[PDB]
């Protein structure tokens, strides 16, 4: 049984012709005091020719805009060390440590979507004096710790039994480990912003950290120790699918400071030119 799906293409509006005009219709004079954005197509101000316009606003929809993978965390962990807490990587989940996808997601106040998560794990042999060994392929475990579960204390913990937490074993040399994630939230939309506190006495922690608690991730080398040290770096890539977004906001201007807060330093609105009348002369023999 085959089903035919209908997909309509949304072109942009053509240019209707026009001629001279001498009337009391002023399509130009308006009043911005009303919070209303003038709809003056060129055919209202000048004489235009009929132009069938085939262009499309497809690559600017929200799904085409956001559904592209982007890195959101990089972390390193060693096969052997003398710290036992550097033998595995760990981090709380948020899209907020890399400025690119942060700023991208933060043109909207509430974003509701599924995701496609990918991991790029790349090991290197640590620089030393006595290199040279035959180590077999490394395999890695990526465990997701929801908020509440027990978190590991070493790479030989019991928690890595991953009885109910989902976790991925991947043996280096194959295609990256990818999986898909539903809308795992308790609100009705991930709230990028939040003007409020956690405690009802109007104090506590301010803003985003209050709302979103999505747990942690813990990555480790399953193999075991290593004759000579090696260090692996894991990068995590988020790609939002089935994207819905609400209440847009002006794009960020000032540079980000930390992943907790929206604190900033004041910056200029834009960069300078010589005068207010300055247009450079570029037609010159």
């Amino acid at each position: 049984v085959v089903e035919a799906v209908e997909n309509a293409v949304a072109r942009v509006a053509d240019t209707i012709s026009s001629g001279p005009s001498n009337s009391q219709a002023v399509p130009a004079l308006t009043a911005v005091e009303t919070g209303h954005t003038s709809q003056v197509t060129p055919s209202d101000t000048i004489q235009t020719r009929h132009v069938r316009n085939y262009h499309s606003r497809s690559e600017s929809s929200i799904e085409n805009f956001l559904c592209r993978s982007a890195c959101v965390y990089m972390g390193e962990y060693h096969t052997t060390n003398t710290d036992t807490s550097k033998l595995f990587a760990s981090w709380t989940i948020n899209a907020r440590r890399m400025v690119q996808m942060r700023r991208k997601l933060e043109l909207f106040t509430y974003v509701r979507f599924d995701m496609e998560v990918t991991f790029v794990i790349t090991s290197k042999q640590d620089q030393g004096t006595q290199l040279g060994q035959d180590m077999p392929p490394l395999t890695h475990q990526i465990m997701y710790i929801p908020p509440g579960g027990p978190i590991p204390k070493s790479v030989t913990d019991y928690t890595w039994q991953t009885s109910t937490n989902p976790s991925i074993f991947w043996t280096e040399g194959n295609a990256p480990p990818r999986m898909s994630i539903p809308f795992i939230s308790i609100g009705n939309a991930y709230s990028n912003f939040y003007d409020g506190w956690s405690h009802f006495s109007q104090n506590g922690v301010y803003g985003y950290n209050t709302l979103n608690h999505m747990g942690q991730i813990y990555v480790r080398h399953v193999n075991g120790s290593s004759p000579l040290p090696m260090t692996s770096t894991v990068r995590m890539y988020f790609k939002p699918k089935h994207v819905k977004v609400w209440v847009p906001r002006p794009p960020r201007l000032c540079q980000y400071k930390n992943a907790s807060t929206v604190n900033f330093t004041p910056t200029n609105i834009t960069e300078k030119r010589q005068s207010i009348n300055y247009i450079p002369e570029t037609v010159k023999p």
């Binding site: 085959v2 035919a4 997909n7 919070g35 954005t37 085939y54 799904e63």
Partner: protein, 59 residues
């Protein structure tokens, strides 16, 4: 066998592709890159009374 044959993205001036879903969860599907809808008057013209583009904005 539970398929759906939709249309590809071609420009204007053998175009049908086939989709089958394999997983038991809609959070495993592809992305909906072929929905193009708009309603700018929500942000562009959010006013109680209409304004007709050829009458004075006041008066």
């Amino acid at each position: 066998m539970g398929a759906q044959v939709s249309t590809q993205k071609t420009g204007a001036h053998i175009i049908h592709y086939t989709n089958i879903n394999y997983y038991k969860d809609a959070a495993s599907n592809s992305a909906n890159r072929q929905d193009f809808s708009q309603d700018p008057g929500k942000f562009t013209e959010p006013v109680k009374d209409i304004m007709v583009k050829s009458l004075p904005a006041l008066n």
